[PDB]
């Protein structure tokens, strides 16, 4: 019996923000679940994530000195690795968030501002969101070319690692690839094909979808590299991604989608493609064993989903 799925963009308003949160499906020994203070601050993020409504614009956040601090560490070190372990297609965009989207060690750049640019070049937009989104429904997300994007900043003591998404994770990880008509259509096309999928089959396409464009590896002219959002998002993981002593193996969605997917920890293992073409295809083609009992169709004109 095909489960609920959203028909229109504004349906995305329905239950809303069904997400993974600090003690009751996530735990770690880390300040940015342990730090009582830290906590409190995070509760002003969600509930405006909470009370956004399709149409909004996005709320414009007053950063903490603290968390500008935090943005800043995380992008200078990051942006120092880069040239050395991502893979080309990521390197290409990443000029034009400097340009065109105010990218600065000095300020944090707004969602809203993101969202703006994204639609012009690839007609992706964001829409806030409280935690690590379900996958479900962030996958059905994509269908529409939205995005869910935390708006939080992880806990300053840490700029390293962080055991849930936070804007870092956002902005660093996912928009340069999100601004490539390809990327962006690549996206689309895997949300779409969950739609209405059963219980198991989401779970498994979400599974091969975290080992790929969350955590997937590729090689590039005989080399490791890296093209994984969670990967390039962490200063300490993306250098051990790379180190010599993780655990890699090929990427193939029949042993893949048995993998746990680790939300709180570095990965316990890593997957690699031949190439990152041959990942998307390996992606689109493991989306259509699927087994529903329907096609669909995106119509960019109504913003709706036809059956
Ligand atoms: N570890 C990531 C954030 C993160 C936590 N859980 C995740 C799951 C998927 C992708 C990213 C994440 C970072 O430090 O930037
Ligand atoms: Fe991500």
Redesign the pocket.
Known sequence: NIPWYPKKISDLDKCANRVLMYGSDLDADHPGFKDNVYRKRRKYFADLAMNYKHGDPIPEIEFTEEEIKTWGTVYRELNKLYPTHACREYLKNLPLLTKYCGYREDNIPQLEDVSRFLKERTGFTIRPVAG?LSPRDFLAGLAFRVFHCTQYV?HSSDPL??????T??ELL?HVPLLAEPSFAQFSQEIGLASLGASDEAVQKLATCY?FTV?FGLCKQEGQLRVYG??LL??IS?LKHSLSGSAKVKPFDPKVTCKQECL??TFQEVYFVSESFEEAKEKMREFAKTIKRPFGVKYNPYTQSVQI
Do not use: Q
């Open positions: 690590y992880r690692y962080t055991p849930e998404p936070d870092c994770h990880g975290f969350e959002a969670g998002s962490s993981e939300i709180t």
